[PDB]
Design a binder for this molecule. Sequence first.
Ligand SMILES: Nc1nc2c(ncn2[C@@H]2O[C@H](COP(=O)(O)OP(=O)(O)OP(=O)(O)O)[C@@H](O)[C@H]2O)c(=O)[nH]1
Ligand SMILES: Nc1nc2c(ncn2[C@@H]2O[C@H](COP(=O)(O)OP(=O)(O)OP(=O)(O)O)[C@@H](O)[C@H]2O)c(=O)[nH]1
Ligand SMILES: Nc1nc2c(ncn2[C@@H]2O[C@H](COP(=O)(O)OP(=O)(O)OP(=O)(O)O)[C@@H](O)[C@H]2O)c(=O)[nH]1
Ligand SMILES: Nc1ncnc2c1ncn2[C@@H]1O[C@H](COP(=O)(O)OP(=O)(O)OP(=O)(O)O)[C@@H](O)[C@H]1O
Ligand SMILES: Nc1ncnc2c1ncn2[C@@H]1O[C@H](COP(=O)(O)OP(=O)(O)OP(=O)(O)O)[C@@H](O)[C@H]1O
Ligand SMILES: Nc1ncnc2c1ncn2[C@@H]1O[C@H](COP(=O)(O)OP(=O)(O)OP(=O)(O)O)[C@@H](O)[C@H]1O
Ligand SMILES: Nc1ccn([C@@H]2O[C@H](COP(=O)(O)OP(=O)(O)OP(=O)(O)O)[C@@H](O)[C@H]2O)c(=O)n1
Ligand SMILES: Nc1ccn([C@@H]2O[C@H](COP(=O)(O)OP(=O)(O)OP(=O)(O)O)[C@@H](O)[C@H]2O)c(=O)n1
Ligand SMILES: Nc1ccn([C@@H]2O[C@H](COP(=O)(O)OP(=O)(O)OP(=O)(O)O)[C@@H](O)[C@H]2O)c(=O)n1
Ligand SMILES: Nc1ccn([C@@H]2O[C@H](COP(=O)(O)OP(=O)(O)OP(=O)(O)O)[C@@H](O)[C@H]2O)c(=O)n1
Ligand SMILES: [Cl-]
Ligand SMILES: [Cl-]
Ligand SMILES: [Cl-]
Ligand SMILES: [Mg+2]
Ligand SMILES: [Mg+2]
Ligand SMILES: [Mg+2]
Ligand SMILES: [Mg+2]
Lengths: 247, 247, 62, 247
Amino acid sequence: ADVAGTSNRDFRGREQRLFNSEQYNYNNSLNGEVSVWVYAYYSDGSVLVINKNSQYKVGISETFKALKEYRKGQHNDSYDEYEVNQSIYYPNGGDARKFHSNAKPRAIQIIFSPSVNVRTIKMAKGNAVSVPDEYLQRSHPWEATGIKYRKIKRDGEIVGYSHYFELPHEYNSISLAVSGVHKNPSSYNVGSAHNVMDVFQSCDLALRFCNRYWAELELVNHYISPNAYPYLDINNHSYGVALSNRQ
Amino acid sequence: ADVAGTSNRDFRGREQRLFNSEQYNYNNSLNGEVSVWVYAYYSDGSVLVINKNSQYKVGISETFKALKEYRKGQHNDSYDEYEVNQSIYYPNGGDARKFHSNAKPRAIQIIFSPSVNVRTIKMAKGNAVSVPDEYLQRSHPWEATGIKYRKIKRDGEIVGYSHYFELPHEYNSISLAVSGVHKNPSSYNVGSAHNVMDVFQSCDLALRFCNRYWAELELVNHYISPNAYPYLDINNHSYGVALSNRQ
Amino acid sequence: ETFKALKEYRKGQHNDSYDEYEVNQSIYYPNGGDARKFHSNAKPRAIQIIFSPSVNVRTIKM
Amino acid sequence: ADVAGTSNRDFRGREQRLFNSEQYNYNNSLNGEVSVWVYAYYSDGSVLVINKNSQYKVGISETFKALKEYRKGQHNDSYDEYEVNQSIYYPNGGDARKFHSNAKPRAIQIIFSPSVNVRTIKMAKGNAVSVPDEYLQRSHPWEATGIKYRKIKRDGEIVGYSHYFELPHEYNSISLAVSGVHKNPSSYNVGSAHNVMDVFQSCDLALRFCNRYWAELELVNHYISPNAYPYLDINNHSYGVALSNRQ
Ligand SMILES: Nc1nc2c(ncn2[C@@H]2O[C@H](COP(=O)(O)OP(=O)(O)OP(=O)(O)O)[C@@H](O)[C@H]2O)c(=O)[nH]1
Ligand SMILES: Nc1nc2c(ncn2[C@@H]2O[C@H](COP(=O)(O)OP(=O)(O)OP(=O)(O)O)[C@@H](O)[C@H]2O)c(=O)[nH]1
Ligand SMILES: Nc1nc2c(ncn2[C@@H]2O[C@H](COP(=O)(O)OP(=O)(O)OP(=O)(O)O)[C@@H](O)[C@H]2O)c(=O)[nH]1
Ligand SMILES: Nc1ncnc2c1ncn2[C@@H]1O[C@H](COP(=O)(O)OP(=O)(O)OP(=O)(O)O)[C@@H](O)[C@H]1O
Ligand SMILES: Nc1ncnc2c1ncn2[C@@H]1O[C@H](COP(=O)(O)OP(=O)(O)OP(=O)(O)O)[C@@H](O)[C@H]1O
Ligand SMILES: Nc1ncnc2c1ncn2[C@@H]1O[C@H](COP(=O)(O)OP(=O)(O)OP(=O)(O)O)[C@@H](O)[C@H]1O
Ligand SMILES: Nc1ccn([C@@H]2O[C@H](COP(=O)(O)OP(=O)(O)OP(=O)(O)O)[C@@H](O)[C@H]2O)c(=O)n1
Ligand SMILES: Nc1ccn([C@@H]2O[C@H](COP(=O)(O)OP(=O)(O)OP(=O)(O)O)[C@@H](O)[C@H]2O)c(=O)n1
Ligand SMILES: Nc1ccn([C@@H]2O[C@H](COP(=O)(O)OP(=O)(O)OP(=O)(O)O)[C@@H](O)[C@H]2O)c(=O)n1
Ligand SMILES: Nc1ccn([C@@H]2O[C@H](COP(=O)(O)OP(=O)(O)OP(=O)(O)O)[C@@H](O)[C@H]2O)c(=O)n1
Ligand SMILES: [Cl-]
Ligand SMILES: [Cl-]
Ligand SMILES: [Cl-]
Ligand SMILES: [Mg+2]
Ligand SMILES: [Mg+2]
Ligand SMILES: [Mg+2]
Ligand SMILES: [Mg+2]
């Protein structure tokens, strides 16, 4: 046989490159996943991730309360935190024993898979009582925020998209939903009558994951990296695996 | 009057047969329910059922964590079980005090009502971090598993469909979503423009039920049987009520 | 060892100690107890008996 | 065939009688069990049974403390009861908050199986510090109490032997060991050199049982009766199953 790495008959090499390219491109086919992640960062360094993975479209929607830090199996000031919520829902509405709940997110990062079409991204960033823009009557139910998404790149390939906003002020008390649609460069509408029931089934088949990791280090090591997910850390370092035409 | 059970003028008998046939056939009309049940069996003999009942289509989606046994009002090693989850999400990722959580399901049974079309059944059986097939990039978001569904029969009538798989190995750690579409032998597409908003409303109107029963006996006696639901027990015994052309 | 002594006991952790009294009553006589579980996960799933190579196997009794 | 219950060819009847006679006589063979039960009766009506079943010989030995009522999974005044014990071991030796512990047995019944030889029965009924007769130096380590054992009879057959003594006074604070030897009408000594190691093995093979039942009713119903054990209740009623030459 020919010697490795020296000729056009390195079939092991050709197959390796195809294996990777096939994965990149499968993800972008209409048969592929589109995935969204919401990372809620807490002052103690821990991070709640909520991930949803589905065909065609995908999204996450959380209440103010659901985005607050919850330490499984530990004390959470659960009564005081009911009282905190009452004062967040209406000023001077509760009887809490703290000015600022350290369970409130300090920041949110939203990441989409590279199979999303960024122009389809929509965000409903509501107030603490789940209203998008001050009052329902004048609320558009979303903002199209794709222009703000940065490309997470590795080796020159787009491995994901990130929108990050800090919530560092006392008044940054939010509810949050986000949504993106899978790339579809074709003129086959996946929600036209021929395939619409499959999109309805995709709503039932969407897989959800949620967990609080103790530190960004741990998220990078045990959540992002093992699963070949895209990420951007606090030091603006990009994580992910470039696959297209790559060995 | 004619004597009962002796002539074609037993109207009480005719009405009884129609009453039953009407129910079988109503369920199969597009006005009818389609229902799915996920049974998660635990080593202590208890069983979590999640049921969803809706028009047109129906499905259930649960995280790894949500399928774990939770004993309401009793101790659940809640801190250790956070640690268990960390080691299930990534090997050697947690600091638990047990090798195997007895809260992990030992088996799953998926049952559909007889109004499902088995060829529409789709399952997303993911890993513990809610990925269908090892990595998102190469994951088809579902498998069409209808061929594996057994018919639950009573008196010769199909009263439901069952797919059962055990999770007896240490590595059987799953997330799970399943979906089926209601029978529609017509060429009226329920999700075409004339009726699509009704299917969107059906997503909001789907009724959910979940509860942990202490034993299969108790599930059969107090969940399955009172509600005329189909079931298949560990001894391969079929439960349900035959209705078509029956008194 | 008794039935009870072979059951799992987690030193320094919770063991459903009251419910497990009730489990034992139903194991000693069917329908004899008032437990909140069908199967106690504290029951052994298997037993291995090992002897040293200095045993005479023909003397083994169980 | 001959008609049942009318002739000497009722083989079903002959076999039934042999089946029963074989059990009575097997128990009395040297291959058979000898069994002892100690019942400790508490003021709340509950009863601790300790049973031991072995070949050749059998016995039970318990400390003062081990004979005290212990309610599994409930509160037992465990600290105060340490203090009670200190005052029982030496007068005015402890700092308890009660004059009389209701955990002290009110009575003891000792029962042997009908395979015991009553003349071999020996009892060490010690004081609270496990001394048989006031001081070790002058203590015989047992008393041969067989003469006091009453026969528990059913249908004229000896189904067991009972010695019962109440402990109704404040000073009845005891330690207790009892022992009996299996019938051996032969001149083959089971502890002579030919079989002595088998008796040593019988010491390891003796099976023990202990449990606190809530009432004498419950002991009769769920302990004594299901297992064909002999008993004598507070109303002097005999329980057991006659087997010799019986259908
Ligand atoms: N400035 C301000 N914003 C409020 C207040 N209450 C709610 N908000 C919301 O805060 C959102 C903007 O959040 P931020 O960007 O963290 O506040 P900012 O004033 O821009 O401060 P910087 O981002 O740090 O420059 C707006 O969309 C408002 O709807 C308030 O009392 N003052
Ligand atoms: N065999 C194996 N399967 C794994 C492992 N990790 C995850 N799995 C998943 O296990 C799934 C199959 O589960 P099982 O059917 O219970 O395993 P099995 O090897 O077929 O064992 P049996 O079903 O009892 O014959 C596969 O789809 C794998 O994706 C692993 O380390 N070994
Ligand atoms: N009488 C008496 N017996 C004691 C005392 N201390 C220990 N004992 C033991 O109590 C045992 C006898 O118990 P009982 O039969 O309940 O006492 P009793 O005086 O015979 O009273 P009755 O049996 O009700 O007639 C004796 O063997 C003594 O060793 C004590 O202070 N007085
Ligand atoms: N919508 C898209 N989805 C996936 N890949 C894309 C998309 N658009 C361009 N690419 C490819 O991704 C790689 C990077 O292109 P891109 O335009 O992001 O890089 P750039 O010009 O260096 O940076 P930027 O546009 O962010 O300033 C190229 O191979 C490009 O063909
Ligand atoms: N998709 C269906 N939905 C409901 N009923 C059906 C369907 N297909 C067939 N039936 C009816 O159900 C009854 C049983 O038919 P079926 O083919 O399941 O039984 P079978 O041939 O004895 O068993 P099997 O096909 O499982 O080997 C018949 O009345 C049949 O007409
Ligand atoms: N040591 C023994 N073991 C077993 N059975 C015996 C023993 N001695 C006698 N028996 C038998 O038990 C039955 C009852 O005999 P037993 O002498 O106990 O009754 P009794 O004379 O009516 O009453 P008691 O001797 O208690 O005043 C008879 O069949 C007798 O042969
Ligand atoms: N504004 C507040 C806050 C707390 N408490 C009291 O604080 C007690 C315990 O604190 P809690 O808020 O419940 O937190 P933890 O018990 O410490 O932690 P967790 O409840 O999450 O286990 C509660 O009984 C509650 O009555 C109160 O009276 N008023
Ligand atoms: N790997 C572990 C597991 C448990 N614990 C400690 O175990 C204590 C109590 O056990 P827990 O896991 O919380 O279970 P339970 O309290 O018995 O039951 P539950 O919390 O569900 O009421 C907790 O305070 C926790 O700190 C720990 O330190 N490390
Ligand atoms: N069949 C049962 C089982 C439990 N309980 C109640 O459950 C409470 C606490 O559960 P327990 O069985 O005692 O287990 P744990 O306290 O969680 O753990 P452990 O007692 O071993 O520390 C007890 O007070 C008991 O009264 C009950 O009433 N009936
Ligand atoms: N003579 C005594 C008796 C009891 N106590 C105190 O009583 C408290 C609780 O009573 P306890 O004797 O321990 O019984 P319970 O806790 O009610 O039941 P248990 O310990 O068996 O669970 C203990 O902390 C112990 O310090 C004491 O100081 N002095
Ligand atoms: Cl495609
Ligand atoms: Cl219809
Ligand atoms: Cl013999
Ligand atoms: Mg706890
Ligand atoms: Mg609290
Ligand atoms: Mg307890
Ligand atoms: Mg105590």
